[PDB]
Amino acid sequence: QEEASGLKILQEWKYKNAVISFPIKTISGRDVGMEENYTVKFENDLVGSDLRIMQKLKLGNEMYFIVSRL
RNA sequence: GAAUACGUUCCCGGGCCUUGUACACACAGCCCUCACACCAUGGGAGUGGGUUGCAAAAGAAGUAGGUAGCUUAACCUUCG
Ligand SMILES: [Mg+2]
Ligand SMILES: [Mg+2]
Ligand SMILES: [Mg+2]
């Protein structure tokens, strides 16, 4: 819906934690890049506000995210 | 050491020929996946003038006109 506008929603819904996953169906080094961006848009953009991270996994076909706020 | 193919519609492989083709190493052709950057174009709240047009107001210099104030060497002086 917009270019680089993800950090907005979590905050709007006043909260504490979450769980956020994505597909990891990289076909033996094919979907690399075209599927490894649901992440690098986090760690990069996640310095500055009340948002933080708790844990991270990558098994099966879904990589769940755990988030924290103060 | 002998009971003895009635028959070639049939990709061990080739010739004659025909239409195409998403063909020239030369035969076959209807997405499942994405924040997509960054240079080029089409826009585009407002800003701003250029050059100003338009409804006017005000009008510096100069040029011209009027003019009872004021002032003055050549001319006429009647001589006021
Ligand atoms: Mg053949
Ligand atoms: Mg003008
Ligand atoms: Mg004058």
Side-chain angles (χ1 to χ4, degrees):
Chain A
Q1 251 50 63
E2 217 85 30
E3 288 69 15
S5 192
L7 322 182
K8 202 194 253 96
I9 57 117
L10 294 117
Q11 176 267 342
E12 301 193 65
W13 213 300
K14 183 178 179 180
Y15 75 122
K16 232 191 248 165
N17 296 132
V19 175
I20 294 169
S21 182
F22 308 99
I24 294 169
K25 0 134 144 239
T26 296
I27 303 301
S28 199
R30 263 315 295 273
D31 242 314
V32 175
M34 296 297 103
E35 229 208 352
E36 309 198 340
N37 274 32
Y38 322 116
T39 59
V40 83
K41 206 131 277 194
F42 219 158
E43 307 102 29
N44 217 67
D45 281 351
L46 188 147
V47 175
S49 295
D50 289 345
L51 295 174
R52 204 54 81 150
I53 312 130
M54 273 152 137
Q55 186 173 355
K56 183 178 179 180
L57 309 140
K58 293 179 179 179
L59 177 63
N61 289 337
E62 270 183 82
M63 61 153 164
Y64 287 75
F65 294 10
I66 300 310
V67 64
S68 76
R69 201 195 275 293
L70 295 174

mmCIF file of all heavy atoms in Angstrom, chain A residues 21-67:
data_model
loop_
_atom_site.group_PDB
_atom_site.id
_atom_site.type_symbol
_atom_site.label_atom_id
_atom_site.label_comp_id
_atom_site.label_asym_id
_atom_site.label_seq_id
_atom_site.Cartn_x
_atom_site.Cartn_y
_atom_site.Cartn_z
ATOM 1 N N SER A 21 5.257 -14.172 10.839
ATOM 2 C CA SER A 21 5.996 -15.159 10.061
ATOM 3 C C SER A 21 5.810 -14.868 8.576
ATOM 4 O O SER A 21 4.987 -14.039 8.178
ATOM 5 C CB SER A 21 5.561 -16.579 10.430
ATOM 6 O OG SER A 21 6.319 -17.516 9.700
ATOM 7 N N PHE A 22 6.586 -15.556 7.745
ATOM 8 C CA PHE A 22 6.606 -15.338 6.307
ATOM 9 C C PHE A 22 7.051 -16.632 5.637
ATOM 10 O O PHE A 22 7.626 -17.505 6.297
ATOM 11 C CB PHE A 22 7.549 -14.182 5.934
ATOM 12 C CG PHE A 22 7.288 -12.917 6.686
ATOM 13 C CD1 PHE A 22 8.047 -12.583 7.784
ATOM 14 C CD2 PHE A 22 6.290 -12.060 6.292
ATOM 15 C CE1 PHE A 22 7.807 -11.428 8.476
ATOM 16 C CE2 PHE A 22 6.046 -10.906 6.993
ATOM 17 C CZ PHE A 22 6.809 -10.590 8.080
ATOM 18 N N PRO A 23 6.818 -16.784 4.318
ATOM 19 C CA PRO A 23 7.296 -18.000 3.646
ATOM 20 C C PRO A 23 8.807 -18.000 3.500
ATOM 21 O O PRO A 23 9.419 -16.934 3.374
ATOM 22 C CB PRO A 23 6.591 -17.951 2.286
ATOM 23 C CG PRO A 23 6.410 -16.510 2.029
ATOM 24 C CD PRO A 23 6.171 -15.859 3.371
ATOM 25 N N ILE A 24 9.413 -19.187 3.582
ATOM 26 C CA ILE A 24 10.880 -19.307 3.327
ATOM 27 C C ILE A 24 11.042 -20.394 2.264
ATOM 28 O O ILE A 24 11.876 -21.298 2.462
ATOM 29 C CB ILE A 24 11.694 -19.608 4.603
ATOM 30 C CG1 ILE A 24 11.665 -18.458 5.612
ATOM 31 C CG2 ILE A 24 13.120 -19.994 4.243
ATOM 32 C CD1 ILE A 24 12.227 -18.826 6.964
ATOM 33 N N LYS A 25 10.261 -20.314 1.179
ATOM 34 C CA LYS A 25 10.317 -21.350 0.111
ATOM 35 C C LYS A 25 11.402 -20.990 -0.909
ATOM 36 O O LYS A 25 11.084 -20.970 -2.115
ATOM 37 C CB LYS A 25 8.961 -21.533 -0.577
ATOM 38 C CG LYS A 25 7.832 -20.646 -0.074
ATOM 39 C CD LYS A 25 7.049 -19.999 -1.197
ATOM 40 C CE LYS A 25 5.569 -19.880 -0.901
ATOM 41 N NZ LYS A 25 4.746 -20.588 -1.910
ATOM 42 N N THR A 26 12.624 -20.703 -0.449
ATOM 43 C CA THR A 26 13.746 -20.453 -1.394
ATOM 44 C C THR A 26 14.092 -21.782 -2.073
ATOM 45 O O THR A 26 14.500 -22.715 -1.355
ATOM 46 C CB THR A 26 14.921 -19.774 -0.678
ATOM 47 O OG1 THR A 26 14.475 -18.491 -0.241
ATOM 48 C CG2 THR A 26 16.138 -19.612 -1.561
ATOM 49 N N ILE A 27 13.915 -21.872 -3.396
ATOM 50 C CA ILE A 27 14.132 -23.166 -4.112
ATOM 51 C C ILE A 27 15.629 -23.375 -4.364
ATOM 52 O O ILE A 27 16.093 -23.008 -5.460
ATOM 53 C CB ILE A 27 13.302 -23.221 -5.412
ATOM 54 C CG1 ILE A 27 11.810 -23.019 -5.135
ATOM 55 C CG2 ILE A 27 13.555 -24.522 -6.160
ATOM 56 C CD1 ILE A 27 11.205 -24.035 -4.196
ATOM 57 N N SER A 28 16.345 -23.952 -3.392
ATOM 58 C CA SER A 28 17.804 -24.213 -3.531
ATOM 59 C C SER A 28 18.519 -22.990 -4.115
ATOM 60 O O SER A 28 19.179 -23.133 -5.163
ATOM 61 C CB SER A 28 18.063 -25.456 -4.346
ATOM 62 O OG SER A 28 19.376 -25.946 -4.115
ATOM 63 N N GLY A 29 18.363 -21.827 -3.475
ATOM 64 C CA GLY A 29 19.022 -20.595 -3.951
ATOM 65 C C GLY A 29 18.333 -20.014 -5.173
ATOM 66 O O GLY A 29 19.048 -19.620 -6.113
ATOM 67 N N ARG A 30 16.998 -19.961 -5.170
ATOM 68 C CA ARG A 30 16.271 -19.313 -6.296
ATOM 69 C C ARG A 30 15.524 -18.086 -5.771
ATOM 70 O O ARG A 30 15.733 -16.996 -6.333
ATOM 71 C CB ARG A 30 15.276 -20.269 -6.956
ATOM 72 C CG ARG A 30 15.812 -20.962 -8.199
ATOM 73 C CD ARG A 30 16.541 -20.031 -9.148
ATOM 74 N NE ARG A 30 15.701 -19.009 -9.761
ATOM 75 C CZ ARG A 30 14.998 -19.171 -10.876
ATOM 76 N NH1 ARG A 30 15.016 -20.329 -11.513
ATOM 77 N NH2 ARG A 30 14.277 -18.173 -11.352
ATOM 78 N N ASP A 31 14.715 -18.258 -4.718
ATOM 79 C CA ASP A 31 13.892 -17.140 -4.178
ATOM 80 C C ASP A 31 14.732 -16.245 -3.257
ATOM 81 O O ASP A 31 14.130 -15.410 -2.559
ATOM 82 C CB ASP A 31 12.620 -17.648 -3.497
ATOM 83 C CG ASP A 31 11.346 -17.167 -4.167
ATOM 84 O OD1 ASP A 31 11.269 -15.962 -4.479
ATOM 85 O OD2 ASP A 31 10.441 -18.000 -4.369
ATOM 86 N N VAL A 32 16.060 -16.397 -3.265
ATOM 87 C CA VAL A 32 16.941 -15.503 -2.458
ATOM 88 C C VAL A 32 16.744 -14.067 -2.954
ATOM 89 O O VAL A 32 16.681 -13.863 -4.186
ATOM 90 C CB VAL A 32 18.418 -15.929 -2.552
ATOM 91 C CG1 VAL A 32 19.335 -14.954 -1.833
ATOM 92 C CG2 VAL A 32 18.635 -17.345 -2.044
ATOM 93 N N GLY A 33 16.651 -13.111 -2.028
ATOM 94 C CA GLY A 33 16.422 -11.708 -2.419
ATOM 95 C C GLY A 33 14.941 -11.421 -2.599
ATOM 96 O O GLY A 33 14.409 -10.605 -1.821
ATOM 97 N N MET A 34 14.312 -12.158 -3.513
ATOM 98 C CA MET A 34 12.880 -11.915 -3.802
ATOM 99 C C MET A 34 12.007 -12.435 -2.658
ATOM 100 O O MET A 34 10.770 -12.328 -2.779
ATOM 101 C CB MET A 34 12.472 -12.464 -5.167
ATOM 102 C CG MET A 34 13.195 -11.758 -6.309
ATOM 103 S SD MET A 34 12.836 -9.986 -6.463
ATOM 104 C CE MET A 34 14.318 -9.268 -5.756
ATOM 105 N N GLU A 35 12.610 -12.958 -1.585
ATOM 106 C CA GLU A 35 11.812 -13.549 -0.475
ATOM 107 C C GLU A 35 12.521 -13.308 0.859
ATOM 108 O O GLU A 35 11.988 -13.737 1.899
ATOM 109 C CB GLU A 35 11.663 -15.054 -0.682
ATOM 110 C CG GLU A 35 10.247 -15.563 -0.545
ATOM 111 C CD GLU A 35 10.217 -17.009 -0.092
ATOM 112 O OE1 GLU A 35 11.294 -17.635 -0.047
ATOM 113 O OE2 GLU A 35 9.125 -17.496 0.216
ATOM 114 N N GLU A 36 13.691 -12.667 0.825
ATOM 115 C CA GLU A 36 14.470 -12.455 2.072
ATOM 116 C C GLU A 36 14.367 -10.983 2.478
ATOM 117 O O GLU A 36 15.331 -10.466 3.075
ATOM 118 C CB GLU A 36 15.917 -12.900 1.862
ATOM 119 C CG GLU A 36 16.024 -14.296 1.277
ATOM 120 C CD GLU A 36 17.385 -14.951 1.431
ATOM 121 O OE1 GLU A 36 18.370 -14.218 1.641
ATOM 122 O OE2 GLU A 36 17.454 -16.192 1.335
ATOM 123 N N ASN A 37 13.237 -10.342 2.168
ATOM 124 C CA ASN A 37 13.088 -8.893 2.464
ATOM 125 C C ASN A 37 12.024 -8.677 3.544
ATOM 126 O O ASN A 37 11.966 -7.545 4.068
ATOM 127 C CB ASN A 37 12.805 -8.073 1.205
ATOM 128 C CG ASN A 37 14.056 -7.651 0.468
ATOM 129 O OD1 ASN A 37 15.059 -8.361 0.474
ATOM 130 N ND2 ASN A 37 14.007 -6.494 -0.172
ATOM 131 N N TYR A 38 11.207 -9.695 3.855
ATOM 132 C CA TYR A 38 10.270 -9.523 4.962
ATOM 133 C C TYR A 38 11.021 -9.359 6.280
ATOM 134 O O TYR A 38 10.404 -9.276 7.344
ATOM 135 C CB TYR A 38 9.309 -10.712 5.061
ATOM 136 C CG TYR A 38 8.827 -11.317 3.754
ATOM 137 C CD1 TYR A 38 9.155 -12.620 3.416
ATOM 138 C CD2 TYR A 38 8.029 -10.603 2.873
ATOM 139 C CE1 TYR A 38 8.720 -13.192 2.232
ATOM 140 C CE2 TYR A 38 7.586 -11.165 1.675
ATOM 141 C CZ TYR A 38 7.938 -12.458 1.365
ATOM 142 O OH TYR A 38 7.510 -13.034 0.195
ATOM 143 N N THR A 39 12.356 -9.359 6.227
ATOM 144 C CA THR A 39 13.214 -9.266 7.406
ATOM 145 C C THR A 39 14.110 -8.044 7.424
ATOM 146 O O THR A 39 14.085 -7.286 8.398
ATOM 147 C CB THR A 39 14.122 -10.497 7.515
ATOM 148 O OG1 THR A 39 14.931 -10.593 6.341
ATOM 149 C CG2 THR A 39 13.320 -11.745 7.656
ATOM 150 N N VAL A 40 14.914 -7.854 6.372
ATOM 151 C CA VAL A 40 15.928 -6.802 6.354
ATOM 152 C C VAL A 40 15.283 -5.423 6.434
ATOM 153 O O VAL A 40 15.957 -4.424 6.715
ATOM 154 C CB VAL A 40 16.804 -6.965 5.095
ATOM 155 C CG1 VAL A 40 16.132 -6.320 3.879
ATOM 156 C CG2 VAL A 40 18.211 -6.417 5.337
ATOM 157 N N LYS A 41 13.977 -5.343 6.176
ATOM 158 C CA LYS A 41 13.210 -4.134 6.427
ATOM 159 C C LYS A 41 12.806 -3.997 7.892
ATOM 160 O O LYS A 41 12.109 -3.037 8.237
ATOM 161 C CB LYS A 41 11.971 -4.126 5.528
ATOM 162 C CG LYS A 41 11.417 -2.746 5.212
ATOM 163 C CD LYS A 41 11.177 -2.566 3.730
ATOM 164 C CE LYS A 41 12.441 -2.182 2.987
ATOM 165 N NZ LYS A 41 12.143 -1.686 1.612
ATOM 166 N N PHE A 42 13.193 -4.948 8.749
ATOM 167 C CA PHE A 42 12.949 -4.835 10.183
ATOM 168 C C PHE A 42 14.180 -4.373 10.946
ATOM 169 O O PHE A 42 14.204 -3.261 11.474
ATOM 170 C CB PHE A 42 12.488 -6.177 10.756
ATOM 171 C CG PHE A 42 11.414 -6.048 11.781
ATOM 172 C CD1 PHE A 42 10.576 -7.117 12.060
ATOM 173 C CD2 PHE A 42 11.220 -4.855 12.452
ATOM 174 C CE1 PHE A 42 9.578 -6.996 12.996
ATOM 175 C CE2 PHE A 42 10.221 -4.730 13.388
ATOM 176 C CZ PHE A 42 9.401 -5.793 13.667
ATOM 177 N N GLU A 43 15.157 -5.280 11.061
ATOM 178 C CA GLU A 43 16.396 -4.989 11.833
ATOM 179 C C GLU A 43 16.920 -3.600 11.459
ATOM 180 O O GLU A 43 17.341 -2.866 12.378
ATOM 181 C CB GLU A 43 17.440 -6.073 11.559
ATOM 182 C CG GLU A 43 16.919 -7.479 11.799
ATOM 183 C CD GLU A 43 16.537 -8.247 10.545
ATOM 184 O OE1 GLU A 43 17.138 -7.983 9.485
ATOM 185 O OE2 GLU A 43 15.635 -9.103 10.632
ATOM 186 N N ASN A 44 16.883 -3.258 10.167
ATOM 187 C CA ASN A 44 17.384 -1.953 9.766
ATOM 188 C C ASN A 44 16.533 -0.835 10.362
ATOM 189 O O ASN A 44 17.053 0.067 11.031
ATOM 190 C CB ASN A 44 17.415 -1.863 8.241
ATOM 191 C CG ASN A 44 18.613 -1.096 7.734
ATOM 192 O OD1 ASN A 44 19.747 -1.542 7.872
ATOM 193 N ND2 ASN A 44 18.364 0.069 7.145
ATOM 194 N N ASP A 45 15.217 -0.887 10.144
ATOM 195 C CA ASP A 45 14.300 0.179 10.538
ATOM 196 C C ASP A 45 13.983 0.155 12.033
ATOM 197 O O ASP A 45 13.319 1.057 12.550
ATOM 198 C CB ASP A 45 13.003 0.105 9.736
ATOM 199 C CG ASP A 45 13.141 0.673 8.335
ATOM 200 O OD1 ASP A 45 14.188 1.282 8.034
ATOM 201 O OD2 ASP A 45 12.200 0.510 7.535
ATOM 202 N N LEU A 46 14.460 -0.862 12.753
ATOM 203 C CA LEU A 46 14.097 -1.037 14.152
ATOM 204 C C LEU A 46 15.084 -0.442 15.146
ATOM 205 O O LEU A 46 15.227 -0.978 16.252
ATOM 206 C CB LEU A 46 13.898 -2.524 14.474
ATOM 207 C CG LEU A 46 13.329 -2.794 15.867
ATOM 208 C CD1 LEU A 46 12.461 -4.008 15.830
ATOM 209 C CD2 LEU A 46 14.433 -2.960 16.910
ATOM 210 N N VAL A 47 15.761 0.644 14.805
ATOM 211 C CA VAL A 47 16.580 1.375 15.759
ATOM 212 C C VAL A 47 15.975 2.768 15.903
ATOM 213 O O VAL A 47 15.900 3.527 14.929
ATOM 214 C CB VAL A 47 18.054 1.424 15.332
ATOM 215 C CG1 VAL A 47 18.863 2.297 16.283
ATOM 216 C CG2 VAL A 47 18.633 0.019 15.295
ATOM 217 N N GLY A 48 15.512 3.093 17.107
ATOM 218 C CA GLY A 48 15.052 4.440 17.377
ATOM 219 C C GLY A 48 13.832 4.611 18.264
ATOM 220 O O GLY A 48 13.722 5.617 18.967
ATOM 221 N N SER A 49 12.875 3.676 18.174
ATOM 222 C CA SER A 49 11.586 3.861 18.899
ATOM 223 C C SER A 49 11.390 2.848 20.029
ATOM 224 O O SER A 49 12.393 2.254 20.473
ATOM 225 C CB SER A 49 10.425 3.824 17.936
ATOM 226 O OG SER A 49 10.478 4.923 17.039
ATOM 227 N N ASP A 50 10.139 2.660 20.466
ATOM 228 C CA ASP A 50 9.853 1.774 21.588
ATOM 229 C C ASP A 50 9.805 0.299 21.180
ATOM 230 O O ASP A 50 9.760 -0.570 22.054
ATOM 231 C CB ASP A 50 8.537 2.186 22.255
ATOM 232 C CG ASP A 50 8.646 3.497 23.023
ATOM 233 O OD1 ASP A 50 9.783 3.953 23.288
ATOM 234 O OD2 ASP A 50 7.588 4.061 23.376
ATOM 235 N N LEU A 51 9.904 0.056 19.873
ATOM 236 C CA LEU A 51 9.845 -1.325 19.338
ATOM 237 C C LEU A 51 11.185 -2.033 19.531
ATOM 238 O O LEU A 51 12.223 -1.361 19.357
ATOM 239 C CB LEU A 51 9.567 -1.201 17.839
ATOM 240 C CG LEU A 51 8.226 -0.606 17.422
ATOM 241 C CD1 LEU A 51 8.183 -0.423 15.913
ATOM 242 C CD2 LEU A 51 7.089 -1.516 17.859
ATOM 243 N N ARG A 52 11.170 -3.314 19.908
ATOM 244 C CA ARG A 52 12.376 -4.129 19.954
ATOM 245 C C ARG A 52 12.029 -5.539 19.488
ATOM 246 O O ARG A 52 10.913 -5.804 19.035
ATOM 247 C CB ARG A 52 12.984 -4.150 21.364
ATOM 248 C CG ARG A 52 14.481 -4.470 21.444
ATOM 249 C CD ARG A 52 15.319 -3.561 20.563
ATOM 250 N NE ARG A 52 15.579 -2.271 21.200
ATOM 251 C CZ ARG A 52 16.667 -1.539 20.993
ATOM 252 N NH1 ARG A 52 17.616 -1.968 20.177
ATOM 253 N NH2 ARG A 52 16.812 -0.382 21.617
ATOM 254 N N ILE A 53 13.008 -6.453 19.595
ATOM 255 C CA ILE A 53 12.843 -7.850 19.194
ATOM 256 C C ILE A 53 13.258 -8.751 20.351
ATOM 257 O O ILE A 53 14.086 -8.376 21.188
ATOM 258 C CB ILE A 53 13.651 -8.149 17.911
ATOM 259 C CG1 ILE A 53 13.391 -7.074 16.851
ATOM 260 C CG2 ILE A 53 13.321 -9.521 17.357
ATOM 261 C CD1 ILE A 53 14.661 -6.499 16.252
ATOM 262 N N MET A 54 12.672 -9.951 20.410
ATOM 263 C CA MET A 54 12.890 -10.890 21.510
ATOM 264 C C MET A 54 13.561 -12.180 21.056
ATOM 265 O O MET A 54 14.506 -12.646 21.698
ATOM 266 C CB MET A 54 11.560 -11.215 22.202
ATOM 267 C CG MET A 54 11.156 -10.247 23.302
ATOM 268 S SD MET A 54 9.361 -10.158 23.509
ATOM 269 C CE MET A 54 9.195 -10.161 25.297
ATOM 270 N N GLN A 55 13.081 -12.780 19.970
ATOM 271 C CA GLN A 55 13.573 -14.070 19.509
ATOM 272 C C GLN A 55 13.269 -14.190 18.024
ATOM 273 O O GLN A 55 12.544 -13.360 17.467
ATOM 274 C CB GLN A 55 12.934 -15.221 20.292
ATOM 275 C CG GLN A 55 13.505 -16.585 19.965
ATOM 276 C CD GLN A 55 12.971 -17.666 20.874
ATOM 277 O OE1 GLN A 55 12.237 -17.388 21.817
ATOM 278 N NE2 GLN A 55 13.321 -18.910 20.584
ATOM 279 N N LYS A 56 13.841 -15.212 17.384
ATOM 280 C CA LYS A 56 13.680 -15.419 15.946
ATOM 281 C C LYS A 56 14.037 -16.858 15.567
ATOM 282 O O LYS A 56 15.024 -17.432 16.040
ATOM 283 C CB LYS A 56 14.525 -14.419 15.144
ATOM 284 C CG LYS A 56 14.366 -14.513 13.645
ATOM 285 C CD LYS A 56 15.198 -13.460 12.951
ATOM 286 C CE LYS A 56 15.058 -13.569 11.454
ATOM 287 N NZ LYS A 56 15.872 -12.538 10.761
ATOM 288 N N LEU A 57 13.222 -17.433 14.685
ATOM 289 C CA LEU A 57 13.387 -18.809 14.241
ATOM 290 C C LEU A 57 13.188 -18.863 12.736
ATOM 291 O O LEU A 57 12.817 -17.867 12.110
ATOM 292 C CB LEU A 57 12.377 -19.749 14.903
ATOM 293 C CG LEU A 57 12.189 -19.779 16.412
ATOM 294 C CD1 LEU A 57 10.705 -19.915 16.647
ATOM 295 C CD2 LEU A 57 12.943 -20.923 17.060
ATOM 296 N N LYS A 58 13.506 -20.015 12.129
ATOM 297 C CA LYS A 58 13.327 -20.199 10.658
ATOM 298 C C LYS A 58 13.265 -21.696 10.336
ATOM 299 O O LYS A 58 14.291 -22.250 9.894
ATOM 300 C CB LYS A 58 14.445 -19.536 9.844
ATOM 301 C CG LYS A 58 14.511 -18.013 9.878
ATOM 302 C CD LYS A 58 15.658 -17.452 9.066
ATOM 303 C CE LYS A 58 15.714 -15.940 9.076
ATOM 304 N NZ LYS A 58 16.863 -15.426 8.293
ATOM 305 N N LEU A 59 12.104 -22.320 10.542
ATOM 306 C CA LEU A 59 11.967 -23.779 10.284
ATOM 307 C C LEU A 59 10.751 -24.029 9.388
ATOM 308 O O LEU A 59 9.980 -23.076 9.167
ATOM 309 C CB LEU A 59 11.848 -24.523 11.618
ATOM 310 C CG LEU A 59 11.629 -26.032 11.525
ATOM 311 C CD1 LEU A 59 12.819 -26.704 10.856
ATOM 312 C CD2 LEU A 59 11.389 -26.629 12.901
ATOM 313 N N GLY A 60 10.599 -25.259 8.889
ATOM 314 C CA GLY A 60 9.469 -25.595 8.001
ATOM 315 C C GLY A 60 9.410 -24.674 6.796
ATOM 316 O O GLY A 60 10.319 -24.758 5.945
ATOM 317 N N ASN A 61 8.384 -23.822 6.728
ATOM 318 C CA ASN A 61 8.234 -22.873 5.593
ATOM 319 C C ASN A 61 7.793 -21.519 6.147
ATOM 320 O O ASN A 61 7.362 -20.680 5.346
ATOM 321 C CB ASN A 61 7.214 -23.387 4.575
ATOM 322 C CG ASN A 61 7.715 -24.578 3.789
ATOM 323 O OD1 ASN A 61 8.920 -24.783 3.669
ATOM 324 N ND2 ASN A 61 6.796 -25.363 3.251
ATOM 325 N N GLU A 62 7.890 -21.323 7.465
ATOM 326 C CA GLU A 62 7.440 -20.089 8.097
ATOM 327 C C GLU A 62 8.390 -19.671 9.218
ATOM 328 O O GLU A 62 8.719 -20.478 10.097
ATOM 329 C CB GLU A 62 6.012 -20.269 8.611
ATOM 330 C CG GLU A 62 4.937 -19.906 7.598
ATOM 331 C CD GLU A 62 3.533 -20.035 8.156
ATOM 332 O OE1 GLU A 62 3.071 -19.099 8.844
ATOM 333 O OE2 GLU A 62 2.891 -21.073 7.900
ATOM 334 N N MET A 63 8.802 -18.398 9.199
ATOM 335 C CA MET A 63 9.801 -17.842 10.122
ATOM 336 C C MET A 63 9.143 -16.813 11.045
ATOM 337 O O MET A 63 8.913 -15.666 10.661
ATOM 338 C CB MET A 63 10.955 -17.235 9.329
ATOM 339 C CG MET A 63 10.535 -16.096 8.407
ATOM 340 S SD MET A 63 11.783 -14.856 8.020
ATOM 341 C CE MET A 63 11.008 -14.078 6.596
ATOM 342 N N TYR A 64 8.874 -17.210 12.285
ATOM 343 C CA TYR A 64 8.061 -16.374 13.152
ATOM 344 C C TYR A 64 8.911 -15.317 13.851
ATOM 345 O O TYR A 64 10.095 -15.515 14.131
ATOM 346 C CB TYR A 64 7.300 -17.242 14.155
ATOM 347 C CG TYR A 64 6.175 -18.000 13.486
ATOM 348 C CD1 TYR A 64 6.442 -19.111 12.690
ATOM 349 C CD2 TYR A 64 4.853 -17.581 13.603
ATOM 350 C CE1 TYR A 64 5.434 -19.792 12.053
ATOM 351 C CE2 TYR A 64 3.833 -18.263 12.962
ATOM 352 C CZ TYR A 64 4.136 -19.365 12.186
ATOM 353 O OH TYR A 64 3.139 -20.063 11.548
ATOM 354 N N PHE A 65 8.292 -14.167 14.115
ATOM 355 C CA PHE A 65 8.973 -13.040 14.752
ATOM 356 C C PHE A 65 8.351 -12.815 16.125
ATOM 357 O O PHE A 65 7.129 -12.883 16.259
ATOM 358 C CB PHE A 65 8.859 -11.754 13.918
ATOM 359 C CG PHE A 65 9.572 -11.790 12.581
ATOM 360 C CD1 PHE A 65 10.096 -12.962 12.060
ATOM 361 C CD2 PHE A 65 9.704 -10.630 11.840
ATOM 362 C CE1 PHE A 65 10.723 -12.976 10.839
ATOM 363 C CE2 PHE A 65 10.340 -10.636 10.619
ATOM 364 C CZ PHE A 65 10.849 -11.812 10.117
ATOM 365 N N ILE A 66 9.175 -12.529 17.133
ATOM 366 C CA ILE A 66 8.695 -12.112 18.450
ATOM 367 C C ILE A 66 9.172 -10.687 18.706
ATOM 368 O O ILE A 66 10.358 -10.384 18.532
ATOM 369 C CB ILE A 66 9.174 -13.046 19.576
ATOM 370 C CG1 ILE A 66 8.690 -14.481 19.356
ATOM 371 C CG2 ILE A 66 8.628 -12.560 20.885
ATOM 372 C CD1 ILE A 66 7.217 -14.608 19.060
ATOM 373 N N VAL A 67 8.249 -9.823 19.137
ATOM 374 C CA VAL A 67 8.497 -8.387 19.234
ATOM 375 C C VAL A 67 8.237 -7.943 20.671
ATOM 376 O O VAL A 67 7.503 -8.595 21.415
ATOM 377 C CB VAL A 67 7.614 -7.616 18.221
ATOM 378 C CG1 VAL A 67 6.167 -7.788 18.564
ATOM 379 C CG2 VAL A 67 7.976 -6.147 18.167
#
